[PDB]
Design a protein around this ligand. Structure first.
Ligand SMILES: Nc1ncnc2c1ncn2[C@@H]1O[C@H](COP(=O)(O)OC(=O)CCCC[C@@H]2SC[C@@H]3NC(=O)N[C@@H]32)[C@@H](O)[C@H]1O
Ligand SMILES: Nc1ncnc2c1ncn2[C@@H]1O[C@H](COP(=O)(O)OC(=O)CCCC[C@@H]2SC[C@@H]3NC(=O)N[C@@H]32)[C@@H](O)[C@H]1O
Lengths: 235, 235
């Protein structure tokens, strides 16, 4: 009854009033490619690592099942499809989102959405959490707070799924296209610090052909940061 | 993202752009009580004895998984929950739906919806096919045809699910209540022909405490019809 017109993403949608985590469900359940798992609320929503993802009523919490018949090397760009999809949807709603490498979307440096890509067996689960009308953690923002009005959650869902289906279908044919879209929509030319063992600081110059963040240290040294269990701070 | 506020029916919803049959998927798959299976169109939709059910885009084709906590003698009344739910939804849209015992809903004697209940142990599948904006076969009608304007399919879905959840929860508490609602919304006082092993005609007087149709033959003989493989025809 939703009448979705997409080719792959959205062929099937499993909606939950409440769920632990859409990503967890998508990983442990057999689902055909393109299946979207979405819930009004998550009781165990999580981000990267062991970070909790606040998922109250009013937000858009979903996961998409994929298994791209593309080179192994291109897999790490799936996260970017999610981020760019969110950016495109936000633009449709008069909001300018900027990508904070590698999986966050900020609006005036306030986090409005986060992407989490995982894999079980050989299916890839693309998780996206976007704040719409829900309450958000301190420092974060939402479509409602940015527009100062209640936004129809289903309208945002339809928009995002439409953008993702297009981005994904193109990715399957031209896997390098997403990189330039990210470059034109990400925060660059600013100083950042990479936390953890062997931490260092420098200017985030760009992302390379593999999506690695290129940082220029003050000494002139150039380091390439892979995205995974990485922690980045804007200085 | 749907924000359904029902207690049982609609806890989860599995949407399909296309499916063979929501009833077949529901019967076959491992699903929890309250899960709704819905599709834009069905390629192999069916009624009783595998009769063909036209399921083009524009209509509401869904099935609900139930596991009623009521005596076995009450199970046969589940079809009425579907028929009444449809009538209540139609009334919300100012359409005069009337029940044709025991699974059809008519508007000016044209079939606008059909209900099909299938069981197998602890699982009962309640299937409902309602013509909304789709083209229909001769003998049938739709919400769009009766109102003269298209109706938002999702609005019909939300209405029906809300009504069914309420009716179902009350059915668990008071299994006899549904019978009163059927009596008040069913076509009675007219002559009908019962088709099965042979056939007979008489006035459809009412339904008894088991949901059996009570027919008064011209001779004054009273017959009680059980819903198995009997078709009712209006003269
Ligand atoms: N609702 C929210 N809005 C903005 N920031 C939030 C937030 N909830 C938590 N945070 C902060 O963001 C951090 C998480 O950042 P990360 O970069 O690691 O991780 C992320 O940014 C990814 C989030 C992915 C969420 C979706 S919801 C659908 C699907 N199902 C799931 O269980 N997950 C995915 C936390 O440590 C918090 O400090
Ligand atoms: N779209 C339509 N609208 C009105 N009448 C129709 C129709 N398509 C077929 N018919 C007529 O209705 C008769 C079927 O009557 P019955 O009393 O046996 O059977 C019914 O009236 C039950 C129909 C149940 C349909 C739903 S759709 C969701 C779920 N998935 C399924 O596969 N089925 C259920 C056919 O023999 C046709 O003459």
């Amino acid at each position: 009854m939703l009448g979705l017109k997409t080719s792959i993403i959205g062929r099937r949608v499993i909606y939950f009033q409440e769920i632990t985590s859409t990503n967890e469900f998508a990983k442990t359940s057999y689902l055909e490619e393109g299946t979207v798992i979405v819930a009004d609320k998550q009781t165990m929503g999580h981000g990267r690592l062991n970070a909790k993802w606040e998922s109250p009523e009013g937000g858009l919490w979903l996961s998409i099942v994929l298994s791209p018949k593309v080179p192994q090397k291109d897999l790490p760009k799936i996260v970017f499809l999610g981020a760019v999809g969110v950016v495109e949807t936000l633009k449709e709603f008069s909001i300018d989102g900027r990508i904070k490498w590698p999986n966050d979307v900020l609006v005036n440096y306030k986090k409005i959405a986060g992407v989490l890509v995982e894999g079980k067996g050989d299916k890839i689960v693309l998780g996206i959490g976007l704040n719409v009308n829900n309450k958000v953690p301190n420092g974060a923002t939402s479509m409602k707070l940015e527009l100062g009005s209640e936004v129809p959650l289903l309208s945002v869902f339809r928009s995002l799924i439409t953008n993702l289906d297009r981005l994904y279908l193109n990715f399957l044919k031209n896997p390098m296209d997403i990189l330039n879209l990210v470059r034109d929509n990400m925060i660059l030319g600013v100083r950042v610090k990479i936390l953890g063992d062997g931490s260092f600081e420098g200017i985030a110059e760009d992302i390379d052909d593999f999506g690695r963040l290129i940082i220029r240290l003050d000494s002139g040294e150039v380091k390439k940061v892979i995205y995974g269990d990485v922690s980045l701070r804007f200085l």
